[PDB]
Design a protein around this ligand. Structure first.
Ligand SMILES: [Zn+2]
Ligand SMILES: [Zn+2]
Ligand SMILES: [Zn+2]
Ligand SMILES: [Zn+2]
Length: 98
């Protein structure tokens, strides 16, 4: 069946209870504990993928494996292609085995 979000946590890869990103066309979902969330957020909740991890500005480049992402100023040397279909990965993954 079709559903708009992934069935697994984008932080740790495991399923169960997730909070789903309310940002337009974001399929990402996360365990509460995986983001230090203490309770299911109410209202419009956008996930960390959309904010640059270095500063606070909006992300324009994205790690395809975890929610690290980077604004204009911090794209350079942040993402490289990985061995998995060339998908870009942040410095937190081995690019040979992301
Ligand atoms: Zn998780
Ligand atoms: Zn999101
Ligand atoms: Zn930034
Ligand atoms: Zn990453």
């Amino acid at each position: 069946p079709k559903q708009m979000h992934e069935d697994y946590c984008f932080q740790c890869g495991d399923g169960g209870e997730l909070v789903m990103c309310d940002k337009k066309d974001c399929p990402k979902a996360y365990h509460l504990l995986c983001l230090n969330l203490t309770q299911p957020p109410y209202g419009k909740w956008e996930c960390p993928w959309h904010q640059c991890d270095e500063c606070s500005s909006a992300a324009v480049s994205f790690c395809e494996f975890c929610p690290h992402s980077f604004c204009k100023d911090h794209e350079k040397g942040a993402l490289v292609p990985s061995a998995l279909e060339g998908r870009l990965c942040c410095s937190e993954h081995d690019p040979m085995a992301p």
